[PDB]
Design a protein around this ligand. Structure first.
Ligand SMILES: NC(=O)c1ccc[n+]([C@@H]2O[C@H](COP(=O)([O-])OP(=O)(O)OC[C@H]3O[C@@H](n4cnc5c(N)ncnc54)[C@H](OP(=O)(O)O)[C@@H]3O)[C@@H](O)[C@H]2O)c1
Ligand SMILES: Nc1nc(=O)c2c([nH]1)NC[C@H](CCc1ccc(C(=O)N[C@@H](CCC(=O)O)C(=O)O)cc1)C2
Length: 159
């Protein structure tokens, strides 16, 4: 089963850590918790963004150019990436934009963090149809001393 995990701001805008204006350690814990011990696919852009493999997860990088770092698995297509994962219960797609777009029609689940923030950003999460997805989990949290803004965790599974 394919899963997408992402953080969204006002208007489906998503961006990198340093691009991000918020500070949400709880969002981090949630990402950790839901992606640990699972393979995670990401685009070249995200990878460079992160600069180190994520521990306790098999990191598979999607890119068209040959890879330049043996600490991760480099793949050339959606299909290839899916196969390098092997037979596991759940694959996690971590972005970015192009990546999300491509896996979405393959996914059955969406783990999303809704950040009550307005920011101008070059990129967005794909417009998906709500009639096709059922919200099975939801939890709103107010800001606090740790978390800079209010956020909502949500999990939808494809109908
Ligand atoms: C623009 O420029 C940046 C792009 O961000 P992003 O979120 O789109 O980055 P991303 O999703 O993190 O990475 C996209 C990149 O991953 C690789 N990739 C994606 N789909 C692939 C496929 N099917 N086969 C092989 N490689 C694939 C390509 O890298 P390669 O260039 O290595 O092929 C592609 O350029 C943003 O900052 C935005 O403002
Ligand atoms: N929920 C969610 N939130 C996000 O901010 C992102 C997504 N999904 N998906 C896409 C993307 C991933 C960006 C991203 C950047 C750094 C680390 C990272 O260092 N994570 C550590 C957490 C450190 C800690 O948990 O204290 C990890 O081990 O996963 C993870 C994800 C951004």
């Amino acid at each position: 089963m394919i899963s997408l995990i992402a953080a969204l701001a006002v208007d489906r805008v998503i961006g990198m850590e340093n691009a991000m204006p918020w500070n949400l350690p709880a969002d981090l814990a949630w990402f950790k918790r839901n992606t640990l011990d699972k393979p995670v696919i990401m685009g070249r852009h995200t990878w460079e963004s992160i600069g180190r493999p994520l521990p306790g997860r098999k990191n598979i990088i999607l890119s068209s150019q040959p890879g330049t770092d043996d600490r991760v698995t480099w793949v050339k297509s959606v299909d290839e990436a899916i196969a390098a994962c092997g037979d596991v219960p759940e694959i996690m797609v971590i972005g970015g934009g192009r990546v999300y777009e491509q896996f979405l029609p393959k996914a059955q689940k969406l783990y999303l963090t809704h950040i009550d923030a307005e920011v101008e950003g070059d990129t967005h999460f794909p417009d998906y149809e709500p009639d096709d997805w059922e919200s099975v989990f939801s939890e709103f949290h107010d800001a606090d001393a740790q978390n800079s803004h209010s956020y909502c965790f949500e999990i939808l599974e494809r109908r």
